[PDB]
């Protein structure tokens, strides 16, 4: 039960746990 729909229709684009 992933969240492909959540990230697909997100508001802030992606989470990006790591920036660098």
Please tell me the distance from the alpha carbon of residue 12 to that of residue 14, in angstroms, as a whole number: 6
Residue 12: CB partners within 8 Å, gap ≥ 6?
A: none
Report DSSP state, residue 20. -
State how far the alpha carbon of 12 is from the alpha carbons of 4, 6, 15, 17, in Å: 14, 11, 8, 13
Cβ atoms 14, 7 nearer than 8 A: yes
Please tell me the distance from the alpha carbon of residue 18 to that of residue 16, in angstroms, as a whole number: 5
Give the residue carrying structure tokens 């660098």.
Answer: 20
Please tell me the distance from the alpha carbon of residue 20 to that of residue 18, in angstroms, as a whole number: 6
Report DSSP state, residue 11. S
Phi, psi of 6 (to 5 degrees): -65, -55
**Determination technique for this PDB entry?**
NMR
Helices (H), 1-20: 4-8
Helix, strand, coil in percent for the chain, rounding step 5: 25, 0, 75
């Amino acid at each position: 039960t992933p969240e492909e729909h959540d990230l697909l229709m997100d508001l802030m684009g992606d989470p990006k746990k790591a920036e660098e």
